[PDB]
Amino acid sequence: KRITTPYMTKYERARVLGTRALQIAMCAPVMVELEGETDPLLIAMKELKARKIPIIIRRYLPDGSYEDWGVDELIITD
Amino acid sequence: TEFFFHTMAGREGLVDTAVKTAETGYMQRRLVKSLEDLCSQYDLTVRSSTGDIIQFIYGGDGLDPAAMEGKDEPLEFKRVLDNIKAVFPCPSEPALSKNELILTTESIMKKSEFLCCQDSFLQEIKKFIKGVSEKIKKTRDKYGINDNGTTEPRVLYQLDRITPTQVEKFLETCRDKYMRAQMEPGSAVGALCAQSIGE
Amino acid sequence: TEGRSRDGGLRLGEMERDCLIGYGASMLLLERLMISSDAFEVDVCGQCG
Amino acid sequence: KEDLPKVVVQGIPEVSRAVIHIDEQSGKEKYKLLVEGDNLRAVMATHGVKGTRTTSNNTYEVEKTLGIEAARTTIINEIQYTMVNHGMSIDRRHVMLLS
Amino acid sequence: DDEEETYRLWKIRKTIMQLCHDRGYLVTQDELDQTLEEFKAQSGDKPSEGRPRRTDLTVLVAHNDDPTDQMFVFFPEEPKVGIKTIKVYCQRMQEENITRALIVVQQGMTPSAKQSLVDMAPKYILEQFLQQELLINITEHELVPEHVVMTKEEVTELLARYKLRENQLPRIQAGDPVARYFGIKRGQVVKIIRPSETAGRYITYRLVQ
Ligand SMILES: [Zn+2]
């Protein structure tokens, strides 16, 4: 069973938001409803608010073992 | 003569401001150039680039200094209890006595969600709540207020009022604050040390 | 280039490389010291090195 | 004839001078001994001195006599001592790493 | 005269007996509660009896597990000890067939004797001291925390807990005073119990090289 903390570190927010914002800037599909928003990153954070982002992080341990976690499943606080 | 002596003391200091930056820069360099590589891993150890151990737990307990509300200490218990009373001054509830307080707090903290916490901290909040139990005892002793709730001057219960709803709220809040002050894995603890020491 | 007489942009010294490390910014440090300043592309032989 | 007068006859060769410090607070109005000289092992090896509480400001000696785990503690004491005796506030976890 | 010297003998006896107790060898409480006056009753006097063997001990068998393993304690009387005295104590050891011997000297040792103390007999160990260092037992010192010698099974347990190799631990050099004190052979682990400002103790592991 997974052991690492259930809180999303701030570095994870920054990297998931960056990568998804880059994916949105290309013609990748978008699934949150957009209220006329245009900036790729405001959309990125809207998809974070609605827990729709389709990414999975892979938390590595220093021995080489790891733990997947859905981005839509971590504990997120501003 | 007074002007000449005073300008001598002025120049002495004004020479300093540039000079006292002469050593500061090279502490700022030599430190960070030996210590910027240390980082905090997902297993709560502190490891160098090659993966060797420096510290089995960061700081001994894994708390970052930017989240310390107290004097090097995560909470100020007195402050939190006073705040939580003010925002929820329930007028319906009855006030607890020493016995009900201890039984209530045992009823809550026995649940496993609190057992996941660091035991040191759990015992710490126990010690505080015992402390408040003693004081409510003294007040009720000095005034001899009966616990039945029937004494005509109802205002006597306003003196050391706590109600169960406030106690549960207080415990959940301490749990948050402690749980959100851990050094997040991946932090550059090594370089933060250098900036805090050169500054 | 170096200075305003020749429009040299501004220097991001070693001392800001450090402040950028402390935040744990890994993509911005790369962006601000390689892909904007002087990125270049090179051929390497894998056999001889 | 001019050399022998210089020879040492009694006391620690490495010490320079020692001063008796006095205090006044209500807890106790007592005395304590403060010494300069770079050799701890000698001062600890005499009658009268409560050797198990003796403390040196320089790291190297305490490491040489009490082992590195005592050196690790003398650093942190020393840095905190100098910071506060100026009056700047640095969180202790930030100096513990350095030691 | 030299009342201080008599007290020095008393103190060195006290501390070595205590050290042998902590190390696990044969020591009994009635011995550990001896007083300076009783020792004066047991011993003679500095001008009358002198530095040679009067009240030194060799009763220090490995009472913990196997008494066949045993400590000598030697008190050579000469200030500087040379190679011939090493040979004398070496044959003393060999004919007594005792595995261990602690050595204390007055004013140091000759270079040849210093050299021999590393290779005299790989089957024997001859940790060396001067009375200087034994006037105080460093464990009683404030600045040093408690140590424990750690056992192979717990070695495996710990390095399983963190999934390490023993080269990934912090280090303590053999020559370090407490390392000398417990006489630990290199390649072992020692538990360090750092006191904290609170009830929480800080436990930490350190490997001897
Ligand atoms: Zn080639």
XYZ file of C-alpha atoms and ligand atoms in Angstrom:
635
model
C 0.000 0.000 0.000
C 1.120 3.524 -0.843
C 2.985 5.288 1.985
C 3.865 8.799 0.828
C 1.844 11.750 2.043
C -1.663 12.345 0.625
C -1.144 16.116 0.335
C -0.155 17.555 -3.034
C 3.176 19.305 -2.663
C 3.529 22.752 -4.175
C 6.111 21.531 -6.658
C 3.523 19.086 -8.010
C 1.008 21.870 -8.543
C 3.570 23.885 -10.437
C 4.698 21.067 -12.676
C 1.240 19.665 -13.475
C -0.010 23.160 -14.251
C 2.950 23.831 -16.509
C 2.692 20.579 -18.444
C -1.069 20.740 -18.871
C -0.875 24.386 -19.900
C 1.609 23.421 -22.600
C -0.662 20.591 -23.729
C -3.623 22.993 -23.925
C -1.582 25.450 -25.963
C -1.279 22.773 -28.627
C -4.536 21.471 -30.030
C -4.984 18.921 -27.244
C -8.647 18.396 -26.255
C -10.147 20.380 -23.380
C -12.884 19.108 -21.059
C -13.785 21.851 -18.593
C -16.356 24.330 -19.856
C -14.655 27.637 -20.640
C -16.351 30.914 -19.712
C -14.828 32.731 -22.671
C -11.348 32.350 -21.204
C -8.355 32.590 -23.522
C -5.130 32.239 -21.562
C -3.895 28.624 -21.587
C -2.928 28.787 -17.912
C -6.190 30.205 -16.573
C -7.791 27.221 -18.307
C -5.171 24.973 -16.761
C -6.092 26.052 -13.271
C -9.816 25.793 -14.037
C -9.285 22.169 -14.987
C -7.432 21.769 -11.693
C -10.343 23.268 -9.735
C -12.825 20.845 -11.340
C -10.501 17.844 -10.832
C -10.515 16.962 -14.541
C -6.788 17.094 -15.376
C -5.741 13.812 -17.108
C -2.260 13.290 -15.668
C -0.689 10.778 -13.283
C 2.392 11.615 -11.252
C 4.960 8.933 -10.340
C 6.512 9.616 -6.958
C 9.980 8.033 -6.930
C 11.685 6.721 -3.770
C 15.488 6.839 -3.473
C 15.763 3.042 -3.703
C 14.132 3.065 -7.149
C 10.637 1.986 -6.115
C 7.690 4.268 -6.778
C 4.024 5.094 -6.218
C 1.508 6.298 -8.768
C -1.081 8.868 -7.735
C -3.906 10.291 -9.806
C -3.788 14.077 -10.038
C -7.567 14.007 -9.507
C -7.075 12.224 -6.134
C -4.489 14.124 -4.031
C -5.486 16.506 -1.231
C -5.377 20.041 -2.680
C -5.510 23.321 -0.746
C -4.658 26.834 -1.894
C 35.859 71.415 17.840
C 32.505 69.748 18.472
C 31.780 69.722 14.734
C 35.168 68.205 13.952
C 34.817 65.445 16.551
C 31.262 64.651 15.477
C 32.216 64.394 11.822
C 35.042 62.066 12.854
C 32.485 59.722 14.418
C 30.290 60.027 11.334
C 33.062 59.041 8.955
C 34.011 56.053 11.100
C 30.617 54.476 10.550
C 30.247 55.544 6.931
C 33.458 53.722 6.057
C 31.845 50.587 7.459
C 28.835 50.137 5.209
C 30.843 49.162 2.149
C 33.427 47.187 4.124
C 31.010 45.055 6.143
C 29.852 43.736 2.753
C 33.395 42.519 1.990
C 33.183 39.328 4.062
C 29.417 38.883 3.779
C 29.606 38.155 0.078
C 32.068 35.341 0.504
C 30.198 33.699 3.293
C 27.185 33.909 0.999
C 29.317 32.176 -1.644
C 31.347 29.615 0.264
C 28.279 28.375 2.117
C 25.899 27.940 -0.789
C 28.675 26.417 -2.884
C 29.038 23.567 -0.422
C 25.452 23.160 0.646
C 23.039 23.823 -2.218
C 22.750 20.178 -3.194
C 20.996 18.782 -0.117
C 17.284 17.988 -0.639
C 14.399 16.372 1.237
C 13.145 13.031 -0.125
C 9.764 11.314 -0.127
C 10.838 9.047 2.735
C 11.543 12.045 5.012
C 15.340 11.650 4.994
C 17.883 14.289 3.962
C 20.246 13.016 1.291
C 23.112 14.316 -0.807
C 23.556 13.818 -4.537
C 25.025 10.329 -4.230
C 22.095 9.208 -2.070
C 23.865 9.053 1.296
C 22.203 10.059 4.538
C 22.773 13.316 6.388
C 19.741 13.268 8.676
C 17.124 10.589 9.181
C 14.456 13.279 9.733
C 14.719 16.932 8.745
C 15.145 18.926 11.921
C 14.355 15.854 13.973
C 10.619 16.176 13.371
C 10.060 17.337 9.785
C 8.695 20.866 10.240
C 9.700 23.755 8.015
C 10.489 27.117 9.639
C 8.236 29.175 7.359
C 5.126 27.647 8.955
C 6.022 28.241 12.604
C 3.388 30.376 14.246
C 5.028 30.289 17.670
C 8.558 30.639 18.966
C 10.097 27.904 16.804
C 6.914 26.004 17.596
C 3.995 25.151 15.301
C 1.122 26.480 17.450
C 0.278 28.869 20.260
C -2.405 26.872 22.068
C -3.844 29.761 24.080
C -4.449 31.857 20.960
C -6.312 29.125 19.137
C -8.667 28.351 21.979
C -9.622 32.014 22.440
C -10.270 32.444 18.721
C -12.379 29.325 18.480
C -14.540 30.422 21.388
C -15.177 33.780 19.783
C -16.405 32.497 16.434
C -18.738 29.832 17.934
C -20.274 31.170 21.136
C -23.054 28.623 21.185
C -25.794 29.882 23.548
C -27.833 26.686 23.541
C -25.218 24.285 24.855
C -24.413 23.615 28.518
C -20.933 24.156 29.916
C -18.701 21.210 30.735
C -17.141 20.370 34.091
C -13.770 18.793 34.781
C -15.080 15.246 34.525
C -17.050 15.778 31.329
C -14.090 17.531 29.745
C -11.706 14.657 30.330
C -14.265 12.080 29.216
C -15.156 14.079 26.090
C -11.570 14.624 25.006
C -10.845 10.943 25.555
C -13.933 10.114 23.517
C -12.603 12.086 20.567
C -8.865 11.442 20.549
C -9.288 7.662 20.854
C -10.424 7.617 17.215
C -7.757 6.349 14.834
C -7.626 9.507 12.706
C -5.750 11.185 15.531
C -3.583 8.123 16.225
C -1.988 8.673 12.820
C -0.485 11.894 14.184
C 2.934 12.198 15.753
C 2.529 10.829 19.262
C 4.660 13.578 20.782
C 2.155 16.157 19.580
C -0.799 14.089 20.776
C 0.575 13.906 24.287
C 1.287 17.623 24.042
C -2.316 18.596 23.459
C -3.271 16.293 26.333
C -1.003 18.215 28.674
C -2.598 21.504 27.640
C -6.166 20.266 28.128
C -5.306 18.991 31.586
C -4.022 22.492 32.249
C -7.363 24.059 31.377
C -9.197 21.467 33.484
C -7.413 22.627 36.631
C -8.376 26.274 36.141
C -12.040 25.556 35.593
C -11.881 23.556 38.833
C -10.536 26.535 40.772
C -13.150 28.928 39.470
C -15.991 26.573 40.341
C -14.432 25.985 43.765
C -13.889 29.627 44.692
C -17.465 30.483 43.811
C -18.891 27.106 44.799
C -21.033 27.041 41.679
C -23.238 23.967 41.564
C -22.915 21.855 38.445
C -26.657 21.232 38.162
C -27.302 24.505 36.331
C -29.951 25.742 38.768
C -28.253 28.581 40.666
C -30.281 31.750 40.164
C -27.402 33.957 38.943
C -27.030 32.221 35.597
C -24.214 34.662 34.812
C -21.982 32.566 37.054
C -21.596 30.110 34.165
C -20.152 32.774 31.863
C -16.920 32.794 33.867
C -15.164 29.732 32.394
C -17.577 28.537 29.726
C -16.622 25.864 27.237
C -19.184 23.706 25.476
C -18.726 20.366 23.723
C -19.113 21.796 20.234
C -16.166 24.086 20.881
C -13.994 21.191 22.053
C -14.433 19.116 18.887
C -13.783 22.183 16.736
C -10.587 22.988 18.617
C -9.182 19.502 18.197
C -9.884 19.339 14.481
C -8.144 22.697 14.046
C -4.983 21.684 15.835
C -4.915 18.583 13.633
C -4.985 20.692 10.478
C -2.361 23.187 11.512
C 0.068 20.478 12.478
C -0.621 18.386 9.391
C 0.002 21.279 6.989
C 3.396 22.290 8.391
C 5.554 19.381 7.232
C 8.525 20.093 4.983
C 7.186 19.076 1.613
C 9.393 16.488 -0.103
C 11.573 17.938 -2.816
C 12.254 21.176 -0.932
C 15.725 22.639 -1.323
C 16.534 22.662 2.357
C 20.255 22.933 1.669
C 20.109 26.314 -0.038
C 17.474 27.733 2.290
C 19.996 27.191 5.078
C 22.578 29.303 3.259
C 20.233 32.218 2.623
C 19.099 32.179 6.226
C 22.705 32.230 7.487
C 24.293 34.713 5.076
C 21.409 37.163 5.381
C 26.401 41.874 -25.623
C 27.354 43.722 -22.474
C 25.882 47.188 -22.104
C 23.349 49.794 -23.109
C 25.766 51.543 -25.441
C 25.533 48.313 -27.474
C 22.173 47.018 -26.179
C 23.487 44.154 -24.060
C 20.551 43.151 -22.022
C 20.934 42.545 -18.302
C 22.974 40.042 -16.338
C 21.449 37.352 -14.135
C 24.411 36.879 -11.877
C 25.428 33.860 -9.853
C 23.602 35.448 -6.935
C 20.231 35.087 -8.638
C 21.055 31.578 -9.794
C 21.030 30.888 -6.067
C 17.714 32.600 -5.326
C 16.165 30.670 -8.215
C 17.493 27.406 -6.797
C 16.010 28.006 -3.362
C 12.475 28.204 -4.727
C 13.015 24.835 -6.333
C 12.295 26.175 -9.809
C 13.856 23.698 -12.235
C 12.219 24.660 -15.532
C 12.633 28.407 -15.072
C 16.312 28.154 -14.253
C 16.807 26.089 -17.408
C 14.746 28.531 -19.442
C 16.468 31.629 -18.123
C 20.015 30.324 -18.524
C 19.877 28.144 -21.653
C 16.942 28.454 -24.021
C 16.953 32.267 -24.060
C 20.628 33.178 -23.671
C 22.806 30.835 -25.726
C 21.278 27.449 -26.600
C 23.191 25.722 -29.406
C 23.131 22.332 -31.125
C 26.076 19.974 -31.577
C 27.067 16.614 -33.087
C 28.699 13.972 -30.874
C 30.093 10.624 -31.970
C 28.851 7.938 -29.594
C 31.617 5.447 -30.360
C 34.719 7.528 -29.607
C 33.179 10.215 -27.403
C 71.837 32.843 34.518
C 69.236 34.791 32.567
C 67.491 31.686 31.240
C 66.554 29.619 34.317
C 64.378 32.382 35.853
C 62.080 31.819 32.878
C 61.531 28.135 33.670
C 58.075 27.010 34.762
C 57.814 25.540 38.252
C 54.103 25.137 38.960
C 50.808 25.250 37.061
C 49.621 24.347 33.580
C 52.146 25.360 30.890
C 49.427 26.100 28.343
C 47.288 28.446 30.461
C 47.719 32.224 30.345
C 45.457 33.554 33.111
C 42.282 32.619 34.961
C 39.533 34.810 36.391
C 36.950 34.172 39.107
C 33.535 35.326 37.904
C 30.896 36.270 40.472
C 27.113 36.474 40.180
C 24.348 38.119 42.204
C 20.914 36.833 41.111
C 18.399 35.680 43.711
C 18.709 32.054 42.628
C 22.297 32.039 43.864
C 25.005 34.595 44.611
C 28.003 32.391 43.871
C 31.264 32.134 41.928
C 32.453 30.348 38.781
C 35.837 29.883 37.128
C 36.718 31.126 33.633
C 40.029 30.230 31.992
C 41.822 30.923 28.718
C 44.214 28.407 27.213
C 44.048 25.789 24.470
C 44.157 22.501 26.363
C 41.005 21.128 27.978
C 42.362 17.795 29.180
C 44.694 19.449 31.671
C 42.148 21.643 33.398
C 39.794 18.714 33.792
C 42.489 16.563 35.469
C 42.702 18.236 38.899
C 41.052 17.973 42.277
C 38.308 20.426 43.158
C 37.035 21.055 39.637
C 33.692 19.459 38.743
C 35.218 18.206 35.530
C 32.047 16.690 34.113
C 30.591 20.163 33.386
C 33.652 21.806 31.823
C 33.083 23.513 28.473
C 35.367 24.947 25.783
C 34.506 27.583 23.206
C 36.860 26.281 20.514
C 35.483 23.273 18.660
C 38.700 21.415 17.999
C 39.598 20.745 21.630
C 36.188 19.456 22.629
C 36.288 17.173 19.627
C 39.782 15.966 20.553
C 38.738 15.154 24.124
C 35.010 14.283 24.044
C 34.558 12.938 20.508
C 32.773 14.240 17.438
C 29.316 13.827 18.873
C 30.295 16.509 21.391
C 31.654 18.674 18.574
C 28.266 18.530 16.850
C 26.687 20.036 19.944
C 29.326 22.689 20.472
C 28.759 24.103 17.000
C 25.044 24.634 17.572
C 25.629 26.121 21.022
C 28.250 28.471 19.611
C 26.281 29.725 16.614
C 23.147 30.280 18.657
C 25.190 32.002 21.354
C 26.718 34.492 18.949
C 23.510 35.133 17.024
C 21.452 35.896 20.104
C 24.211 37.839 21.827
C 23.809 40.073 18.860
C 20.027 39.771 18.827
C 19.088 38.304 15.444
C 16.461 35.576 15.259
C 17.253 32.492 13.178
C 15.187 29.350 13.544
C 17.175 26.563 15.155
C 16.335 24.020 12.462
C 18.247 26.252 10.057
C 21.495 25.851 12.039
C 21.045 22.208 13.017
C 21.435 21.182 9.388
C 24.721 23.043 9.124
C 26.168 21.279 12.131
C 53.225 13.686 50.496
C 51.627 13.595 47.042
C 48.164 13.117 48.529
C 46.883 14.101 45.093
C 48.696 11.102 43.599
C 46.975 8.719 45.998
C 43.638 10.236 45.038
C 44.663 9.777 41.393
C 45.185 6.064 41.975
C 41.821 5.868 43.733
C 40.089 7.625 40.860
C 41.710 5.575 38.099
C 40.688 2.403 39.916
C 37.143 3.724 40.270
C 36.796 4.649 36.624
C 38.355 1.553 35.084
C 36.193 -0.639 37.276
C 33.131 1.327 36.151
C 34.185 1.106 32.499
C 34.628 -2.644 32.738
C 31.157 -2.800 34.265
C 29.557 -0.911 31.386
C 31.466 -2.963 28.833
C 29.797 -6.110 30.220
C 32.708 -7.858 31.947
C 32.714 -9.214 35.499
C 32.028 -6.361 37.926
C 29.979 -6.487 41.129
C 28.138 -3.722 42.943
C 29.974 -4.060 46.260
C 33.100 -3.210 44.293
C 31.469 -0.226 42.592
C 30.357 1.326 45.903
C 33.866 1.346 47.402
C 34.985 4.570 49.065
C 38.336 6.331 49.081
C 38.775 5.466 52.759
C 38.161 1.766 52.156
C 40.630 1.845 49.265
C 43.201 3.387 51.595
C 42.504 0.449 53.893
C 42.948 -1.951 50.961
C 46.040 -0.291 49.500
C 49.277 0.963 51.016
C 50.673 4.430 50.371
C 52.326 6.244 47.493
C 55.787 6.520 49.130
C 55.460 3.078 50.729
C 54.078 0.872 47.935
C 54.808 2.707 44.681
C 53.543 2.477 41.096
C 54.062 -1.256 40.338
C 51.277 -3.838 40.548
C 49.526 -3.490 43.922
C 45.745 -3.295 43.395
C 45.392 -3.761 39.638
C 42.786 -6.220 38.396
C 42.517 -9.125 35.999
C 39.233 -10.582 37.358
C 37.544 -9.035 34.328
C 36.336 -12.137 32.560
C 33.582 -11.908 29.967
C 30.983 -12.588 32.630
C 28.300 -11.545 30.154
C 28.644 -14.627 27.931
C 31.883 -16.619 28.307
C 34.342 -16.079 31.185
C 37.167 -17.574 29.101
C 37.461 -14.137 27.500
C 39.245 -11.963 30.036
C 40.833 -8.550 30.622
C 44.272 -7.827 31.959
C 45.056 -4.464 33.498
C 48.712 -3.473 33.783
C 50.373 -0.623 35.684
C 53.983 -0.300 34.524
C 55.932 1.802 36.997
C 58.435 3.458 34.663
C 57.475 6.869 33.205
C 58.394 5.971 29.608
C 57.758 2.382 28.507
C 59.994 0.767 25.896
C 59.971 -2.271 23.650
C 61.534 -4.590 26.230
C 58.720 -3.867 28.679
C 56.323 -4.622 25.829
C 58.025 -8.001 25.483
C 57.728 -8.631 29.220
C 54.004 -7.906 29.238
C 53.638 -9.843 25.976
C 55.047 -13.015 27.488
C 52.955 -12.331 30.588
C 49.861 -12.325 28.369
C 50.904 -15.310 26.288
C 51.705 -17.543 29.244
C 48.520 -16.468 31.013
C 46.527 -17.040 27.786
C 44.319 -14.016 28.519
C 42.879 -12.445 25.380
C 42.651 -8.773 26.381
C 44.693 -6.282 28.382
C 44.202 -2.572 29.022
C 47.456 -0.612 29.286
C 48.027 2.643 31.176
C 51.295 4.590 31.080
C 52.667 7.541 33.004
C 54.476 9.763 30.478
C 53.974 8.144 27.078
C 55.763 5.461 25.116
C 58.806 5.014 22.926
C 58.381 5.099 19.129
C 59.256 1.412 18.873
C 56.723 0.562 21.574
C 54.167 2.799 19.872
C 54.822 0.940 16.614
C 54.468 -2.502 18.163
C 51.056 -1.682 19.645
C 49.455 -2.143 16.205
C 50.903 -5.526 15.202
C 52.254 -7.305 18.292
C 49.694 -10.123 18.182
C 46.592 -10.034 15.951
C 45.195 -12.631 18.348
C 45.524 -10.074 21.171
C 44.321 -6.504 21.691
C 46.153 -3.963 23.859
C 44.196 -0.702 23.962
C 46.442 1.986 25.434
C 45.835 4.859 27.843
C 47.472 7.324 30.192
C 46.146 8.050 33.660
C 45.474 11.525 32.286
C 42.360 10.452 30.392
C 40.972 8.166 33.113
C 40.663 10.802 35.814
C 37.131 11.283 34.441
C 34.693 8.925 32.718
C 33.608 10.786 29.605
C 30.104 9.329 29.720
C 29.450 11.417 32.826
C 30.192 14.499 30.730
C 27.340 16.811 29.797
C 28.339 17.403 26.189
C 28.146 13.731 25.127
C 24.961 11.652 24.824
C 24.329 7.972 25.527
C 25.679 5.236 23.273
C 24.661 1.621 22.757
C 26.463 -1.079 20.811
C 24.106 -2.434 18.201
C 23.675 -6.063 17.143
C 23.762 -7.728 13.732
C 20.108 -8.741 13.693
C 19.082 -5.181 14.485
C 21.572 -4.046 11.846
C 19.602 -6.016 9.284
C 16.329 -4.732 10.733
C 17.343 -1.075 10.468
C 18.871 -1.198 7.015
C 15.733 -3.035 5.985
C 13.587 -0.262 7.429
C 15.217 2.364 5.228
C 16.478 0.103 2.394
C 20.105 1.219 2.574
C 23.570 -0.227 2.447
C 25.929 0.317 5.355
C 28.133 2.584 3.250
C 25.159 4.993 3.271
C 25.386 5.751 6.994
C 27.129 8.550 8.879
C 30.534 7.765 10.326
C 32.493 7.605 13.589
C 36.247 7.120 13.423
C 37.822 4.381 15.511
C 40.212 6.767 17.235
C 37.360 8.775 18.688
C 37.329 8.835 22.524
C 34.074 6.958 23.109
C 35.009 4.571 20.315
C 38.166 3.857 22.271
C 36.083 3.719 25.441
C 33.901 0.834 24.353
C 36.741 -0.623 22.292
C 34.580 -1.234 19.246
C 36.119 -3.016 16.274
C 35.469 -1.182 13.029
C 32.566 -2.288 10.867
C 29.826 -2.062 13.524
C 26.904 0.246 14.282
C 26.314 2.311 17.425
C 22.980 3.838 18.416
C 23.156 7.488 19.468
C 20.394 8.843 21.681
C 20.422 12.615 21.342
C 18.574 14.427 24.135
C 16.074 17.018 22.977
C 14.315 19.993 24.529
C 11.337 17.710 25.222
C 10.444 14.114 26.063
C 11.052 13.246 22.424
C 14.440 11.612 22.189
C 16.366 11.906 18.942
C 17.669 8.504 17.888
C 20.378 8.262 15.255
C 22.722 5.599 13.905
C 26.427 5.977 13.192
C 28.870 3.529 11.611
C 32.439 2.994 12.819
C 35.312 3.032 10.339
Zn 33.978 9.035 -33.456
